[PDB]
């Protein structure tokens, strides 16, 4: 059988900056500031209803 | 779009929390620490008697600011306690 | 000179300053051949135990003691009294303390400093024995405690009020 | 012979003193070392204390309120004796016990604080969210498959 | 175990238990102790209110009827989440990333 | 403001050389009075009773003689002699003062409240008759003085007249600290708006 | 005057003997007391009134409204409300 394992990321100096460089985004999977964590809490509720 | 998403257990995590023993601890540490820079903060505004912004910073060390460290520490514990109440209060009524 | 300062520093109810002196005064006797310092070795040895009993470092009674230099070559009724007093306090039993003092009674009378402090000691143990009884209970009968400590009922109630 | 003794203490079941005694007196207590000889028979005694304090260890875990009256019967000890071995156990910091001397309750239930309780309830929530996903993996397999 | 499992309440007096098992209330406290110990149930015991307080039941064979039963409650919880999330959008409308 | 007085007065017993100020007999007396008010049982014991300074000056005046007697009786859970000692200290300490003659009313009201408090803090139940025998006043006289001080929230006790028992409630705890905070915070808010509004206008 | 008293009697106490209710509501006959009971929807059985049921019942039907019962101000709502004030 196949057991699920979590998928997340890890990146080098170079690779992270190259991602940031593509992106015009400020992120929102971060859970840094007040603003960002607000967005997240609502995404969490929507995640829960769909499952 | 692949690159912007980096997490997938972000939905689960936003509705988890830590043990509440260390939350109480952060709240005590925050209040007690702000007393100690509040003492300095009173002393700072005894001064502000020297003409020029730069002269003030060099002479009376206006850069090591008590003002900066209070505002920031108050902000941190404050923002945190808004979220804490928000998460916990959602959890009881939503789940049950 | 260390000794006399010792008995007097003890009396002021500071048993840190006392111990430090009675160690020095003892060492001279221990290592100095006996003659009439046999008598002064024994007086210090008792007081040297004493300081440790009042501070409630009741392990340290037994550290000083050993089977080769203190219970061999300077054993008396007086040494036997202090190790019994030590044993009474570790239990926190007033009964135990009372057993020891009843049968070494003239030995307690025999030294003024040991006496003045055993009056003091009595009271700190009365407190400790009372505390031990009611710690693994709650809502304990005043008639049950009174049996154990041996005091009369009224006296137990007032004493408890103070603590 | 040895198996029966190890089995008694490893299980989390009470047992009465007059019955362990009789049972293993002609098997294990006759053998030398521990038990057997004259000085060694004076360690048979010290067994009686481990068996009644063992009973108390089982009862803290399963009972939360139990009567002082019923407790006397299970350990097979008088009122005076029972309270003593309780007190001795709480100085050792092995159990938490509170006896009411009019013979009301003996409490084994932990003294609680808001913080302990908030931690317990946090556990349960996290745990729910984890179960929902895990059952969710298996739901994918059997849906496509069948 | 059985009387505990088919019902949805979490406590039983010694009086109910004694009729069920044909044992007096003396042996019933032993009966309870072995069950908790075996891993069939969890709970706590009073002898001052003479309750057994159950907090855990052992998952057993799932019958067709019990699946329907699971489901009903999940529909109850879905609606509740979806309702809350609608309010939580209207609130905080100008402050999001 | 006896709170600051007390911290300084313990200091003034050991050291001061009198430089246009009142005698050391006077200062010693003053230290006693402040001592009872401010400090709990154990601190009363250290700072007043076991003071080398007080012990070494003795009782050589009418006012010092009465006050030293009142300190000991609070500490001893003597209650009979607490009310007699109190009347004598009013006459012979407070009145001849030039600083506690004006605070006389506040001071005597406080100690009266202190003695009742200390017994209640120690006792879950008491009888009105029991409490009143110990103090040396009647039952009736006691009930008045008790019912005066209940709404001032130091005593924290209800009193039943059916059975004559005095039950001792204790609602002061986390709940206590909560009343204080909202109140002081409310005041702080007033200050912020009023100073603020005057400047914004400028 | 009788109505205002009946409003008070509910919260004050919960059950009273028949003669003491008569005295309070002002009637010269025990029967006129039970007639006012039935109008005010309160059961006297075995010469005893009960408010343990009744008071809670009347307050509930009235307290049911759908114009300020969806406004209570949630805990969740209060956290959000604070939240936006800090960053705006």
């Amino acid at each position: 059988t196949f057991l699920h394992l979590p998928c997340t990321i890890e990146a080098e100096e170079a690779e992270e900056i190259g991602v940031e460089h593509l992106l015009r985004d400020v992120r929102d999977q971060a859970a840094g500031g007040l603003s960002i964590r607000l967005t997240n809490q609502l995404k969490s509720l929507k995640g829960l209803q769909s499952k | 779009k692949m690159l912007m998403n980096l997490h997938k257990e972000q939905w689960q995590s936003g509705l988890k929390m830590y043990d509440y023993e260390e939350k109480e601890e952060s709240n005590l540490a925050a209040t007690k620490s702000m007393v100690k820079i509040a003492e300095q903060y009173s002393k700072r505004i005894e001064e502000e008697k020297e003409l020029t912004e730069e002269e003030l910073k060099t002479r009376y060390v206006g850069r090591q600011d008590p003002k900066k460290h209070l505002s920031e520490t108050a902000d941190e514990t404050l923002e945190n306690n808004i979220v804490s109440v928000l998460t916990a209060g959602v959890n009881s009524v939503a789940i049950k | 000179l260390d000794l006399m300062s010792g008995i007097l520093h003890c009396e002021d109810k500071d048993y840190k300053t006392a111990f430090s002196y009675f160690f020095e005064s003892f060492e001279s006797y221990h290592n100095l051949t006996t003659h009439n310092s046999y008598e002064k070795a024994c007086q210090v040895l008792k007081y040297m135990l004493l300081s440790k009993i009042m501070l409630n470092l009741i392990d340290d009674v037994k550290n000083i003691l050993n089977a080769k230099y203190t219970k061999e070559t300077y054993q008396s009724r007086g040494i036997d009294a202090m190790k019994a007093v030590a044993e009474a306090y570790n239990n926190r039993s007033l009964l135990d303390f009372n057993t020891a003092l009843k049968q070494y009674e003239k030995e307690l009378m025999g030294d003024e400093l040991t006496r003045s402090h055993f009056n003091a000691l009595y009271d700190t143990l009365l407190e400790s024995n009372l505390c031990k009884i009611i710690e693994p209970f709650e809502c304990v009968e005043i008639s049950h405690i009174s049996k154990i400590i041996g005091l009369d009922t009224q006296q137990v109630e007032g004493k408890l009020s103070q603590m | 012979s040895q198996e029966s003794l190890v089995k008694l203490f490893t299980t989390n079941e009470l047992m009465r003193w007059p019955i362990v005694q009789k049972t293993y007196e002609p098997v294990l207590n006759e053998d030398d070392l521990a038990f057997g000889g004259e000085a060694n028979k004076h360690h048979w005694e010290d067994l009686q204390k481990r068996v009644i304090e063992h009973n108390l260890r089982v009862i803290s875990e399963y009972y939360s309120r139990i009567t002082l009256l019923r407790l006397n019967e299970l350990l097979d000890l008088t009122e005076s004796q029972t309270e003593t071995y309780i007190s001795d156990l709480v100085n050792q910091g092995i159990i938490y016990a509170k006896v009411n001397r009019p013979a009301k309750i003996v409490n084994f239930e932990k003294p609680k604080n808001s913080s302990q309780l908030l931690n317990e309830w946090s556990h349960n929530v996290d745990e729910l969210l984890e179960h929902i996903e895990t059952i969710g993996h298996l739901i994918t397999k059997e849906e496509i498959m069948h | 175990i059985e009387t505990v499992f088919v019902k949805n309440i979490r406590m039983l007096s010694f009086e109910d238990i004694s009729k069920a098992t044909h044992l007096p209330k003396d042996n019933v406290e032993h009966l309870v102790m072995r069950a908790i110990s075996l891993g069939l149930l969890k709970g706590s015991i009073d002898q001052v209110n003479e309750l057994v307080t159950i907090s855990w039941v052992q998952p057993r064979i799932i019958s067709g009827d019990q699946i329907t039963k699971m489901k009903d409650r999940l529909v109850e919880w879905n609606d509740q989440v979806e309702k809350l999330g609608k309010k939580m959008e209207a609130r905080g409308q100008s402050i999001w990333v | 403001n006896f709170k600051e007085a007390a911290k300084l007065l313990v200091d003034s017993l050991a050291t001061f050389t009198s430089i246009e100020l009142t005698s050391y007999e006077s200062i010693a007396t003053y230290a006693s009075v402040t001592g009872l008010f401010t400090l709990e049982r154990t601190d009363l014991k250290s700072k007043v009773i076991d003071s080398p300074e007080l012990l070494s000056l003795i009782s050589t005046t009418a006012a010092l003689q009465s006050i030293s007697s009142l300190t000991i009786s609070l500490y001893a859970s003597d209650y009979a002699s607490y009310f007699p000692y109190l009347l004598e200290t009013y006459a012979n300490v407070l009145i001849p003062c030039k600083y506690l003659n004006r605070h006389a009313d506040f001071f005597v009201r406080e100690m009266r409240r202190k003695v009742y408090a200390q017994l209640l803090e120690s006792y879950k139940t008491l009888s009105l008759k029991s409490m009143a025998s110990a103090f040396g006043v009647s039952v009736a006289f006691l009930d008045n003085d008790l019912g005066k001080f209940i709404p001032n929230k130091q005593l924290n006790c209800v009193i039943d007249r059916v059975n004559g028992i005095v039950e001792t409630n204790r609602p002061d705890n986390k709940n206590a600290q909560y009343h204080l905070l909202v109140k002081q915070g409310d005041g702080l808010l007033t200050k912020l708006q009023k100073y603020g509004a005057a400047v914004r206008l400028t | 005057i009788r109505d205002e008293i009946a409003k008070n009697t509910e919260l004050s106490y919960d059950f009273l003997p028949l003669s003491n209710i008569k005295a309070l509501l002002f009637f010269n006959n025990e029967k006129e007391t039970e007639k006012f009971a039935l109008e005010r929807n309160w059961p006297i059985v075995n010469s005893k009134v009960y408010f343990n049921n009744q008071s809670k019942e009347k307050a509930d039907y009235e307290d049911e409204m759908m114009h300020e019962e969806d406004q209570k101000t949630n805990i969740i709502e209060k956290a959000m409300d604070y939240a936006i004030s800090i960053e705006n």
Side-chain angles (χ1 to χ4, degrees), chain E residues 33-45:
Chain E
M33 207 279 315
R34 291 297 296 107
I36 314 165
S37 196
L38 281 166
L40 327 173
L41 295 155
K42 310 284 167 73
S44 54
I45 314 168

Side-chain angles (χ1 to χ4, degrees), chain E residues 6-17:
Chain E
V6 294
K7 311 200 284 170
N8 288 110
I9 47 170
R10 295 273 67 163
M11 72 294 110
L12 296 164
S13 46
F14 289 0
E15 294 60 77
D16 300 296
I17 299 179

Side-chain angles (χ1 to χ4, degrees), chain C residues 135-139 141 144, chain D residues 83 87 97-102:
Chain C
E135 263 174 282
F137 285 71
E138 56 185 304
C139 201
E141 300 185 40
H144 175 42
Chain D
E83 298 174 345
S87 293
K98 285 301 203 171
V99 189
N100 295 16
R101 191 56 183 134

